[PDB]
Structure 1
């Protein structure tokens, strides 16, 4: 069996190992490492963070040339990621999504096909239809951020902001590499992932102290703001906001969120008259504990063979698909279906 190596806990580093295993089982990212395609993408010159890509890829290579029961040390990799993101120096407990964002940023920057970023000035695109404005904003983003990492993870949100007085809808397009979803509080019979996606993409009323300034009305007005997905990523990472808004002491929200193994259909969240995507689950990062402390594991589906395993540092064990959906799920990794 391939790709079933455990990762040594170096001292509170399961947040890191959980993410690394999710990435190890991200088929196309794994393949990029195994086929050594990153070598062509690395920047010339004495760069401080060349070794971040090299050690990440070496780790994935090691995992996928291992035998079951093997335990691999990610210590050389940790040295490189903490050089890129000094918050990961030492051996404190950390957030897995925070780690994911810093790691992918580092990898992306070092294999960016754009080696000299153009400055770019803001443009008035009011003459363009919404979809064309979206495409142009996307082009402008890609001329600065264009990598294999982006190929997999990046999508585009549309934010539509309508003034309730004059009816003008101001649109902006924000790239995203993951989506952080509020957790529903009024779900019946249960809270579903779709409920959480709906909270993210719902009409947000901006009134009272949140009134935006309408440039057309020349004053503060009640506005309605709504997200839709303009461009879907190949890999969709969903991050559940498992933390209360207490102004005194944050508590972890441990609500069961029911997410599908297959056929996550995001039709209802696509921008108007825009082609939507359907996804299957392939990995989950689980957190057990409180906001201040706890323990991470990963559940990952091996690419192609379809078998699920639990990755808990050195311990890698088979699991049934009936064991994958739990209340501990914190990050969900989805890939395009068929």
Structure 2
């Protein structure tokens, strides 16, 4: 069931990113394999090493989703998770304002970083030199470790000039009118960018921020967006389940989130920190969307 989130004073952006993330069913199962068990993985010399327990960054994330459904109360306090983030980046310590997309990026790569680190640290502590420790990092950084996020949000982008392959986790769409129109704006030939590996869950961003010379103003122009998108010409149907809406400007603003509470379409519930309101899909389509979350259907 959908439930409210207790704002800490300025974490409405953090509250929103938790709510739409809470509607990711596939992430639930994967975290269960993360916590247990510490299975031994063997790697031939280019090494049977047990798996270290997940770090607190991935830990406090994991228990967070259990209180989303198990707990009877309709208000949840995510104090621990943001506090876990506090040591990760000093910029979040305090009550200075932050942004939704920026929080996600450290949130995302931080999930894999603990997987990146605790696995690499596991062989080093089991086998014991600093040069060897660097070599372990050197081998991995040039290697594509299949992280859990990379199996949920991880995608591969290809740019032609000469084909260059780059992994990605999100799309930052430039803004000059539909989201598809922005999608076309992403893939002109100058130099064409095409995805060959579609992530199971797609995260899309709209650059409503732009500086007109020396004037910083937010693009308040509404964008039209459907629940279903065809991604085959850009490489495939993706169903809308998570929407982030910002209400304000670059300096003063308010973040609201929309979620799809599903186990045909139903149901959209407006989230305002602790305020939970049922809303029709038409109002969702009329919202000033900022981030789009889509689900694999085909």
TM-score, normalized by the shorter chain, greater than 0.5: yes
The match for 1:94 is 98
Structure-2 residue corresponding to 1:50: 55
Alignment of 1:239-254 (within 5 A): 239-254=205-220
Alignment of 1:46-85 (within 5 A): 50-67=55-72, 70-85=74-89
Q: Is the Cα contact below 8 Å between 1:41 and 1:113 reproduced in 2?
A: no
Residue equivalent to 2:204: 238
**Structure 2 equivalent of residue 316 of structure 1:** 276
Residue equivalent to 1:31? 29
Structure 1, residues 84-125: CA drift from partner, whole Å, max 9, x if none?
A: 12211111221101011111111122234982355359xxxx
Please tell me whether the aligned partners of residues 153 and 177 of structure 1 are also in contact (alpha carbons under 8 angstroms). Answer: yes
* Offset of residue 18 of structure 1: 0.5
Count of paired positions = 270
Q: CA deviation at 1:245?
A: 3.3
| 1:296-335 superposed matches below 5 A | 296-304=255-263, 306-335=266-295
2:138 to 116, 119, 122: 119
Pick which of 87-96 and 11-20 moved more. Answer: 87-96
3-state SS of the aligned residue for 1:292? coil
The normalised TM-score by structure 2 is: 0.84
Distance change >3 Å, CA 98–CA 321, structure 1 → 2: same
1:220-252 alpha-carbon deviations (Å, 9 max, x no partner): xxxxx1101111110110000111232312110
Deviation at 1:41, TM superposition (A): 7.3
Tell me the C-alpha RMSD between the 2 structures. 2.3
Q: Say if 1:28 and 1:113 are closer, same or farther in 2 by CA, change over 3 A.
A: farther
* Alpha-carbon shift at residue 63 of structure 1 (Å): 1.0
Are residue 177 (structure 1) and residue 169 (structure 2) matched? yes
Counterpart Cα distance in 2 of 1:95 and 1:113: 27
Contact 1:157/1:230, CA 8 A, preserved across alignment = yes
- Secondary structure of the structure 2 residue equivalent to 1:16: helix
Distance 1:114 1:92 in 2: 31
Find the partner of 2:112 among 91, 104, 108: 108
Listed as ranges, the gaps of 5+ residues in structure 1 are 122-139, 162-169, 186-190, 205-224, 271-276
Aligned counterparts of 2:75 and 2:111: Cα–Cα separation in 1: 24
Counterpart Cα distance in 2 of 1:333 and 1:66? 25
Separation (CA, whole Å) in 2 of partners of 1:280 and 1:291: 29
SS at match of 1:29: helix
Is contact 1:112-1:146 (8 Å) kept?
Answer: no
- 1:32 Cα deviation after fit: 3.2
Secondary structure class of the residue paired with 2:294: strand
1:282 aligns with 2:247: no
Q: Deviations over 1:171-223 (max 9, x none)?
A: 1111110100012x3xxxxx11110011111123xxxxxxxxxxxxxxxxxxx
> Normalising by the residue count of structure 1, what TM-score does the alignment of the two structures yield?
0.74
How far 1:64 moved relative to its partner? 1.5
The SS at the match of 1:244 is strand
The answer to whether the 8 Å contact 2:20/2:259 transfers is: yes
